[model samples]
Every structure is written in C-alpha cells, then in structure tokens.
Target: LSECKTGNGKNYRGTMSKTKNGITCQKWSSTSPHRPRFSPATHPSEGLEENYCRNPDNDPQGPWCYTTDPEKRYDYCDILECEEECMHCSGENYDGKISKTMSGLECQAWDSQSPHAHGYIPSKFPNKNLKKNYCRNPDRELRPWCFTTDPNKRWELCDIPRCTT
Candidate 1:
C-alpha cells in the first residue's frame, strides 16, 4: 500500500506509524504514554490499528496520531501527498518521488547502466533530479516512466493517476 496520502486522507489506510518529527505513535488502544480520547472501540469505523497514523476526524492536515512521547499530545505524520492530479499524462512537470512502475516493478537507478543501458544520465539532464530509481518523464513521454530492474524488461510507464483537471 502507498504510504502517500491524497486529499484529506479520510480514506487513507497505509501503515505509516511515525510522526513528522520521527516520534512513534501511541497505539490507539493504549493509555500508557498518553491516553487517547479516540480508540478502535470509540472510533469503530476508523482504521486505528497498532500505532499507525490515522485521521478519524478528517483533519485537513491529513493523518496524525498521539505521540509516544509524554510531553507531546499529538503530531502529524510525515506522509507525503500523492502526486497532484494535473501532473499525470505526459508528466513533464511531475516531480513526485514515486519509483514503481504500473505493474509494481522497481525502477533501475538513473545512474546505473547495468542490466538496462540507456542515455538518460543525470549529468545530461541537470534539472531532472535524476537520482536514485525515481520515476520521471525527462523525455516528455505519455507519463512518468523508468528503466526497470527486471533484466527482461527495459522500461515501462508508471501508474500515476490521470489528471482530473
């Protein structure tokens, strides 16, 4: 599941369990470090489980949770928002850090030429931030895509959602 949130994250159910400042979340069912007013029993519809961050009240700031630190009552999680809708389909301006293909294949590193040899080097595209295995559309393709780690497959488009606007 994608840890990145979309919209208010009211329907987000990923397992990101730490705060923005790296504080582990206090379990919704536990009252040890901090007693929470919301719990699985209290907020039955909310997917409060383990110590994962959640937004049961539909906070505009996205997912948050009570911190394990006794001094802090609660804090927002560091979940990144999903790529904006307008960046899809020839995502030349898409700069989100999504690194997987449409079929869930891991992307080959932009700098690595092994297994898959290509000319989309980072030095050639200084502004592309072509670091790591992140998906990008430096060539103005139909969508953001990347070279695959799969030796058989060279490259493929990513699963970025279509632009609604």
Candidate 2:
C-alpha cells in the first residue's frame, strides 16, 4: 500500500493488483450513500440536502425496500427525488426490507458497471460491517430513518434525533 489520490482529492488508503497487465488499483473503505436515510424532524441538515426514502408504494411510513439494480430502483423510486438504499457493488449486502420477508434482513449493491462486478461505489457494504448495524429513530414517525453503524463499536442502537448538515 502507498499514498494515492483520486480525481476528487479523496485520499486512497491502499492499493492492489489485478494483472497480467500489471493494472494496479487504489484501495477504499466504506462510503455514505448518495441518498441516505434520515428524518427531517430530527436532522434538519439532512432534510436540507438528502431526500427522504419512501417505500415501494411511495409511502414514507415504509415497508421500504432496497433495490440495487437501476431498473428495480427506478421502479420503486423517482430518479431524482427519491433517496433509495443501495450498495456500492454486488455482494450480499444488507437490506431491512428483503430480510424482513426472508429472515429479517437481506442486502444488495447500490451501483456498479460491467467488467468489474463488486468493486465500486455501488458494491456491497461487506459482511463484517453488517454485523454492526443499528436502528435509528426519527422525531417524526415513519419519516426516513437510518440504520447506523460505527467502525469502532460493536452492535448498538443508533444515536437518534441526530441531525446532519
């Protein structure tokens, strides 16, 4: 691993190889969702920027489901206004909606492309991180709330009413 930076000036923490071509790539950790879940009643800043996620039927109260593929995602959410849950890439990420039906939680990648399946922003959030999940409470009932996690903590409830800007 060595010092690396992407076009955005976001520092790359490490790197690896995928080669006979000797093609080296930068290493990355986790990233926040493009449209993450939050409650406007609790997080004023979140409301200022990220749109609230709605359920499949467009109910803010949910039974909200996460869809990784663009087709499925679009079917559930409007392209610009909706803040749908998704993974960075395909892997067996987490989803409260899918899991509630199957066993309580399932997962999917948020975004990705051809050639590389599970190595981008839409890739899975990973198994180790999943175990650290938590439920968030919004001041308004059924408004979009987030499932919080900490890289340092074990499993714990998310700090509720936390605002984002």
Candidate 3:
C-alpha cells in the first residue's frame, strides 16, 4: 500500500534500494527506469558545465579550489586576467554585448534586440554596403561599429557617430 505513495506524495515508479525480505517500501530516486522518461545526471566530471569557482581575493590562476560540484555559493569568479589588449567596458553606461559565438569565441553585438545588453550599438544594420561588428579602442572602450567593404580593415572606424554608452 505504502509502495504506491511517497512521504511527499510524489509517485515514483521503481526502487533503487532493496531489502532482503521485509515488505515496507518507500520512494526511489526520480531517475528510475519505470518512469515515463528516465534521465540522469551524467558523471560529474563530464556532465558539469565548465565554470570557474569564485575567489574573493583576485589571485592569478588561483589558490583556486577544484570543486566537487557545479555550485554557485559566492561571487562566481574564474579569476581570468583581462587580456592586455582587451578593452573592457565597465562602470556606468557600460552595457555591452558580451556573449560567445557558436564556436565558443566571444562575439559582441550579436543580438538584434537590446544591443547594449550584448555589445555597444543597438542595431547591426549601420548602412548599405557596410557590415556591423565590434571593436575596442586603445583605452579599453568597447563598442559596435559598421565596417567598410574590407572585413579585415575594422581598425578603420566607421564615419558614423558612436553610441552614447
């Protein structure tokens, strides 16, 4: 009778734990095969998404803790050192496009809506015959800009006005 119900009232379909002969039974893990679908967390080493544990003190590379879990208990810091050439947008009005492309390379201003949320310019369509992309100044100010016909020549700034951000 008790086998059909759990203390929390959720129905579990199979038993992961077993006794020799005693008849009383409780619920099993939600991952049981008898359930309509059985999905389980993969082994932690592979199933856990790659992430850096937080470090209160900015230590290079770390006094880092190799964790036993994918946990977020503090300010999640991978403690990555900003690249010397990386122009970081921070502080007030610094909303910028910051996301990785499908290949895992960081691509900016990729989203059409809320351009500031991803990079600098709100729209990628700058003008005819020119394409929109992202770049940073020598001072680490990042923004999106339309480019000339030559994709390699992004260093040449678009003649248009910059975003107020």
lDDT agreement with native, every candidate: 0.85, 0.24, 0.26
**Model 2 agreement with the true structure over 1-165: per-residue lDDT tens digits:** 222222221222222222112222111111122232333344443211222222213244322223333233221222111111432122122222221111223122223222223332312533223221223112222322222122232222222221231
Q: Which scores greater on TM-score, model 1 or model 2? A: 1
All candidates in order of TM-score, best leading: 1, 3, 2
107-148 per-residue lDDT for model 1 (tens digits): 999999978999999999877767688888888788889999
Q: Which model scores highest in TM-score?
A: 1
- How many Å off is the CA of 97 in candidate 2? 9.8
Question: Considering lDDT, which of the candidate structures 2 and 3 is the better prediction for this target?
Answer: 3
TM, every model = 0.54, 0.17, 0.18
> Candidate 3 lDDT, tens digit per residue, 1-165?
111212221222222122222222221123222231111243223211222222223344321222222231112212223212222332122222323322233333333322233233434422211112333232232442322233333223222223333
> Native-vs-model 2 lDDT?
0.24
Using lDDT, give the best candidate's number: 1
Deviation from native of the Cα of residue 28 in model 1, angstroms: 0.7
